[PDB]
Amino acid sequence: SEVEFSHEYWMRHALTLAKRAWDEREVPVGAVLVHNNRVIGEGWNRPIGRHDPTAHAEIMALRQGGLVMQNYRLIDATLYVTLEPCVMCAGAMIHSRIGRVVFGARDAKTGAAGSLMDVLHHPGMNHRVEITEGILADECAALLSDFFRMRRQEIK
Amino acid sequence: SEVEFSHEYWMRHALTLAKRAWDEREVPVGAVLVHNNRVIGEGWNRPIGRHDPTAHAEIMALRQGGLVMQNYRLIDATLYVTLEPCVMCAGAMIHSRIGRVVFGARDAKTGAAGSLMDVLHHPGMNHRVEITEGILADECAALLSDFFRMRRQEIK
Ligand SMILES: [Zn+2]
Ligand SMILES: [Zn+2]
């Protein structure tokens, strides 16, 4: 079913992080940054609790990676995130120079890797980040679905 | 002649922050976030020294503003930055819901406020950030130019 170090194996770890966001009552998105099959950064969405509009899963994983690698450039790393990245995160991926982003569910309204727009393969960027899409898309989208319901199950 | 609280008055303050980046040998870009004419965030470019690819002046200013306002949404705030923002920072401004970005020099190669692409007024966004461009542009451009000149020298 899920071989060690395959995309699904790392995405499942990202889903463990997306659940931390779930517990903190934030949109459940998780991300893990991997280099040579070692975790060098982990993150979950938490803009509300951090009072920070930039606190997305991807930004958190990328900033930790920079610290772990002692380099703002994260050459050859692969960033796994449970939801297609937004424009901000796609831009951050370009500046980080990572090798690839692997995402789960598509974000139909604001995804920047094909959905709302494509930032990553736009011709004028100075670095091409490869894209793998739809890994465990169903579980990723169900987590989000369970959240937007259990959430309206709050608006009394 | 620069009236207190005018765009030029705030951009001149962002230029002082830009010189801090210069002093740290970082591309010289500075930013100041203002709400009701009071500083709620300040930033300068420091990705290299912070080992953080997301450490642009704008991101630093927005994060500080969020702390001060106790809210990731920075409604009606105005962000001054000495150089047209990149895709990542433009994306961040949209998530923060600021009212306006005022910038200095255009970034022809990779500006996301019209140069390389326009993220801010893309029609699929859920928030429109107003744009004021070119405030003290010549000064902002000279600082950047003097930098890439001084740097190209330093290469022994
Ligand atoms: Zn994002
Ligand atoms: Zn930027």
Curated annotation (Swiss-Prot), chains A, B:
UniProt cofactor(s): Zn(2+)
Pfam families named in the record: MafB19-deam
Name of the protein in its database record: tRNA-specific adenosine deaminase
Cofactor note: Binds 1 zinc ion per subunit.
Taxonomic superkingdom: Bacteria
Outcome of swapping residue 52 to E: Resistance to the cell-killing function encoded by the gef gene family
Gene: tadA
Chain positions recorded as Zn(2+) binding sites: 56, 86, 89
Organism: Escherichia coli (strain K12)
Family indicated by similarity: Belongs to the cytidine and deoxycytidylate deaminase family.
